[PDB]
Amino acid sequence: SKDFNNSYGISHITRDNMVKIPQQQNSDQFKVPAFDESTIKNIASAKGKNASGNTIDLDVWDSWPLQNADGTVATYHGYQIVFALAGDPKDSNDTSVYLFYKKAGDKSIDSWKNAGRVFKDSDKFVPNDPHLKNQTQEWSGSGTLTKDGKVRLFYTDYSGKQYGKQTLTTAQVNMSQPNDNTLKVDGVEDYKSIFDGDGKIYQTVQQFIDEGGYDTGDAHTLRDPHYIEDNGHKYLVFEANTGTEDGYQGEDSLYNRAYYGGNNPFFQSEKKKLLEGSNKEKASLANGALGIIELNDDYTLKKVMKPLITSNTVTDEIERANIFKKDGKWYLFTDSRGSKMTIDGIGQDDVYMLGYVSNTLTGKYKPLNDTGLVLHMDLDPNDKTFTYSHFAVPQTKGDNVVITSYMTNRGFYEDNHSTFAPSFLVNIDGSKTSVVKDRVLEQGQLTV
Ligand SMILES: [Ca+2]
């Protein structure tokens, strides 16, 4: 019949694993710790210029640490460095990368200084690039300290003028130290696009357009590039959507057993309900994927590779791709909004970090804690301590990783700007994770 089973030689976030999450999630093993409201502060140095040209307090969102090749937090001439998306809510659709820095031993949020924006608004027009001139926003990515001791950034070039086109982009950030307690961004070089989708393995913005995306409610993604090295090879892992040959979006996807898991009765009943309901469109269009490309030594595209994992029928958005090696195993994480999911029992208030483990980088990823659930955040978006963009930072030693995130901090009474959330620990052991109880760290802490 119309029923089939195609894995496309890749792993999947299955409906069966997802349906089990609501009954599993109400547990301190998985719940993002409650944060103390009275202790929360804005990032003090987080000040810049609005569109009007006046200096204001910035909102600070997605942030990522400068990492060593294996994912550990780098030290750059005595400083830890964090790249953060920031902006003025009166520009709203304006997002730029900022460089924050702190002496390695310092702990407090007040110790974080701001070297300012990585890019000047003129920087994107300088190189001979196919895409950069059309950029409207700087979206998330990663930072790596090279062998050569260079600061190498990866970020997302977003073009709202080109229908929301998203390009994986790289640049070397040139740094200097004016004095012993200051870092300065000198400017950028090696500033070039890397990848914007191929069409067969990863969806292009043109396919999104052609299929009438803005009408259908489709969501096109090609963002959050995360740098990783393995066996001498260099890779980016990133948020994307499937292409025409690795399980394309559409109604046929609802007949593909690979996306359901469980038994035949489960598949038959779940499919029936999907094809019937108001979720039929949402599910059909849902084709999120965690993609992977290999880079050359100059950080240009070497090879477009098949996705590590997809979330067909489940969601169109698995964000903040993250991956590292621990204990000889490969751990893959992604954040997800319940509002973007099609799963019964998962609501608009639900926000997750999901997690998967494989013995090899491109091998089969199996769900952590049987379902994939690692973190659950369900605080209302109006709560002061709402957190988002949860990210696992691997540590030099020990079984714990540091979870960083931002805190929207939208209080009636100050402080009241998006800031670093207090960090915390998650214990990793085999295919099983747990929030380390009562070990809340400082806002924006990277290492323990
Ligand atoms: Ca889609």
Q: How far is the CA of 164 from the centre of ligand 1 (A)?
A: 14
The number of helix segments (H) and strand segments (E) in the chain equals 6, 25
157 is in an annotated binding site: no
Contact between 33 and 40 under an 8 Å Cβ cutoff? The reply is no
Q: Is 372 left (phi over 0), alpha (psi -120 to 50) or beta?
A: left
**Which CATH class name applies to 1-444?**
mainly beta
Q: How far apart are CA 47 and CA 87, in angstroms?
A: 9
Which residues on adjacent β-strands are paired with residue 233?
A: 230
68 is in an annotated binding site: no
* Dihedral sign for Cα atoms in the order 358, 364, 368, 373: positive
Q: Locate 262 and state its tokens.
A: 């469980």
140 is in an annotated binding site: yes
Q: How far is the CA of 377 from the centre of ligand 1 (A)?
A: 24
Breaks (C–N over 2.5 Å) after residues, the chain: none
Q: How far is the CA of 219 from the centre of ligand 1 (A)?
A: 5
190 is in an annotated binding site: no
Catalytic residues, by residue number, are 62, 319
Q: Give the rounded distance of the alpha carbon of 248 from its chain centre.
A: 22
387 exposure class (CB count in 10 Å sphere: 0-12, 13-18, 19+)? buried
Collapsed DSSP state (helix, strand, coil) of residue 329: strand
Q: Is the peptide bond preceding residue 415 cis, with omega within 30 degrees of 0?
A: yes
Experimental technique, in short, is: X-ray
Q: How far is the CA of 389 from the centre of ligand 1 (A)?
A: 21
Q: How far apart are CA 117 and CA 96, in angstroms?
A: 7
Residue recorded with tokens 């066996």:
231
Nearest to 142 by CA among 324, 309, 308, 289: 324
Strand segments, DSSP code E, in 104-150 are 113-117, 137-145
Extents of the domains making up the chain: 1-444
- Which residues does 283 contact at the CB level (< 8 Å), separation at least 6? 253, 254, 274, 313, 342
Q: Locate 213 and state its tokens.
A: 């995306």
Q: What is the DSSP letter of 31?
A: B
Nearest to 52 by CA among 91, 95, 98, 85: 91
Alpha helices in 243-372 (DSSP H): 264-276, 280-285
